[PDB]
């Protein structure tokens, strides 16, 4: 689990969204595993606006932060689960690192702020759903 709180928005993995998230839906994209809902308080998380390929992510399965090199956002094939059939997930970034299903929601940060959240994993690779292109999160 885990979420980004920027202004009057809450950003979570679409597969983990609650009933409240769906009742206060602003935007969702099944192909990106993202869902944004409204909040009645003003969060102060900074979203990075950059082309960075290094950063640090939180891994709840190890209670540790890990520094990573990660790929540029792209369409990557993702195997079937109880949430999605096998498909291509867009805006995904992979890094060499540890993850388990419960790690989805862990924030990936660079020196400019929040880059995205853990969304996929397997075989010593961790995938992050990028959020740096969603410029409307600040406006």
As annotated, the binding site for Zn(2+) includes 50, 52, 110, 112
Task: Name the β-bridge partners of 96.
Answer: 125
CB of 8 to ligand A1BOY, least distance (A): 25
Does residue 102 sit in helix, strand or coil?
Answer: helix
Is 15 among the residues that bind Zn ion (CB under 5 A)?
no
CB of 110 to Zn ion, least distance (A): 5
Nearer to Zn ion, 49 or 65 (CB): 49
33 and 90 in contact (C-beta within 8 Å)? Answer: no
45 binds, among ligand A1BOY, Zn ion, none (CB under 5 to 8 A by kind): none
Would you list the DSSP string of 6-23?
EEEEEEEEGGG--HHHHH
Does residue 111 sit in helix, strand or coil?
Answer: coil
Exactly one of 25, 50, 75, 96 binds Zn ion (CB under 5 A); that residue is 50
Give the chain's end-to-end CA distance (angstroms, integer): 26
Q: Which positions lie near ligand A1BOY, rule CB under 6 A?
A: 15, 33, 78, 81, 83-84, 89, 99-101, 103-104, 118-122
């Amino acid at each position: 689990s885990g979420a980004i709180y920027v202004g009057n928005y809450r950003v979570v993995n679409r597969h983990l969204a609650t009933h409240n998230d769906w009742a206060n839906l602003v935007w969702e994209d099944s192909s990106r595993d993202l869902l944004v809902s409204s909040t009645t308080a003003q969060g102060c998380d900074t979203i990075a606006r950059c082309d960075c390929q290094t950063g640090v992510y939180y891994c709840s399965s190890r209670r540790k932060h890990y520094p990573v090199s990660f790929s540029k956002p792209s369409l990557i094939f993702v195997e079937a689960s109880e949430y999605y059939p096998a498909r291509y997930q867009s805006h995904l970034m992979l890094a060499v690192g540890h993850s388990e299903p419960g790690d989805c929601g862990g924030i990936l940060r660079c020196q400019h702020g929040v880059v995205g959240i853990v969304s996929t994993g397997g075989n010593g690779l961790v995938g992050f759903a990028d959020v740096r292109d969603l410029l409307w999160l600040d406006e």
